[model samples]
Target: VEITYGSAIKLMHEKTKFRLHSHDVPYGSGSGQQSVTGFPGVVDSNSYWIVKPVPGTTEKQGDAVKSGATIRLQHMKTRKWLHSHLHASPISGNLEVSCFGDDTNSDTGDHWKLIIEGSGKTWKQDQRVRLQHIDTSGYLHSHDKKYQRIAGGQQEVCGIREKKADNIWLAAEGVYLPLNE
Candidate 1:
């Protein structure tokens, strides 16, 4: 059974605890640009808490590519939303949103990754990615990509095709299967 963005959001809001946090990915990826309008916070990028899945919402399929899947949350600070499925081979479980963050520019050039424990071949999963941020002048903006599949043991870009491409980013998101489903 596939889930839609609206339905996922509704479900999360109804049954999860969303909190805010500040941290840095020592190896955060970006265009390497230093302009305010560009992706800043290079040496150390700042990020906020997006979503954490509650327990009992997922079912583990095992340690196979079939069990790998992930969702994304974006912001102008983080220019791109990322998702993935790389585990499901052992039939581990479903994808869950964990933690994600980006720079302040919010430019399309910014990149992030979404790491999951399963793959599309095993679960026929479609991970959803979305973004939100404020403009330089101070206005909120956001967008959500349609759900898409990630091949087992493979990583696919949000808006592009071709495997293991460097132009894309896969920031981490989602809860562990043992904690949910």
Candidate 2:
């Protein structure tokens, strides 16, 4: 989608119903914090994300995401930013894991570039987008793999892959609302 500032979205896997999600706990080989998983249906803030344009990019709202136009996927619930680093993926040693990161710091690894395979320049809602970590070449990926440590059992674990069918995500609108409301 031609995501604009303030746009809320649920990144659903193109081939499945699972939506991208983040857990409050830390993850990684050592830290075991910031787990990224795919959960079915929108449940809470952890499933909602705001798309913010990277600074110094195209100011034009409708233009296709430029090559240098990066973005930050900010989790609404924990306020942590989606990030990937040099850490190897738990499932795929060659790839990296997508983790939650502090937003206050200037970490280049936190930025991502959205690529719409055939869209050329402009992106539209419902278009399949590939999120490539700006610092690493890895793309956001989720499969049937299970991570028992998280709350949601059988929850699909999210990781980074050089390129996989699981990396394709369909952009859908709507921010998860509070249950009390």
| Winning model by lDDT | 2
Candidate 1 has a TM-score of 0.22
Q: What TM-score would you give candidate 2 relative to the actual structure?
A: 0.79
Model 1 segments more than 4 A misplaced: 1-38, 43-46, 49-56, 59-67, 74-158, 167-181
Instruction: Encode model 2's per-residue lDDT on 1-181: one tens digit a residue.
Output: 3555556778888876688887677664733547677787666567888776665655433333444457887887777778777666565454555556566654677788888867456445677678888777778877776666655453444446567787888777653222221
Q: List the residue pairs that clash in candidate 2.
A: 1-124, 25-34, 26-32, 26-33, 26-34, 27-32, 27-33, 27-34
Cα lDDT tens digits, model 1, 83-164, are 2222111111212111232433223222222233234333212332222111111111111211123222211112222222
Which 10 consecutive positions of candidate 1 have the poorest summed lDDT? 134-143
Q: How does candidate 1 score on lDDT?
A: 0.23
Best by TM-score: 2
